Every structure is written in C-alpha cells, then in structure tokens.
Amino acid sequence: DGPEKNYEKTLAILQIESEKAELRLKEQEVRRLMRARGDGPWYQFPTPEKEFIDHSPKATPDN
Amino acid sequence: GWVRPDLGQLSKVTKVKTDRPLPENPYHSRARPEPNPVIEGDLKPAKHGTRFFFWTV
Numbered sequence: 001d002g003p004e005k006n007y008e009k010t011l012a013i014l015q016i017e018s019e020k021a022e023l024r025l026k027e028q029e030v031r032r033l034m035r036a037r038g039d040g041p042w043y044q045f046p047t048p049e050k051e052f053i054d055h056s057p058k059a060t061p062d063n
Numbered sequence: 064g065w066v067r068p069d070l071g072q073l074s075k076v077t078k079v080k081t082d083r084p085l086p087e088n089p090y091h092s093r094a095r096p097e098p099n100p101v102i103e104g105d106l107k108p109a110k111h112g113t114r115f116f117f118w119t120v
Contacts, residue, residue, distance in 0.1 A: 023110060040099065
C-alpha cells in the first residue's frame, strides 16, 4: 500500500496508547483520593440503616 | 354527678388542645452534613475498552 498507511496507523496506535496511559494514571490518582477521603462513588463503606430506627413514642418520655 | 369510665375508655388517645408552641428541634440535632455529590450523566462506553495492559478491546 505504501509508507503513508503504516505512518498514519502508527500515529493512531500511539494516540490510543497515550490516552490509555493517561487514563490509567488518572484512575490511580482518583482511587487514591477517594480512599483517602471517601466522597465519590467508590470506597463507600456501610453504616447502620435509618429505616430500622423506631421513631414511635416510647413508654418513657426521655427518649 | 361523676360517672366512672368504662372498661376501655381511659386507655385511648385524647387529642388535647394546647397553646404551647411545638418544639421545632427536639433532641438538639446538629447540622446533618450533606451527602456526596452524586454524578449524573449518560453512560458512555469505557474509553479504549478495558485498558487492561495489552488487551485492545
């Protein structure tokens, strides 16, 4: 086919690999920041549920 | 002229009328910090596949 086909294919391959490397580094930094301070969707450790707290009036008023 | 209550009369709710204002903050609750900023958007596919080493797809 000629040298231009291999040239442009190499450029496309390099762009794909560079974007993948950038995204991998971004993923590492995002995971580290989330686990350091959990504020995104990931590393959300559980907590006792609100929906099983009895809010009805008790036998004792001081509750 | 007093009448003794029946078998099941003293043991029911009463709906007493009062003018004392309703306490707006029982238990002296704190600020209740806001939840995490949930991410919204369309679910696009993963960029360049799984990006797991040499796997292209």
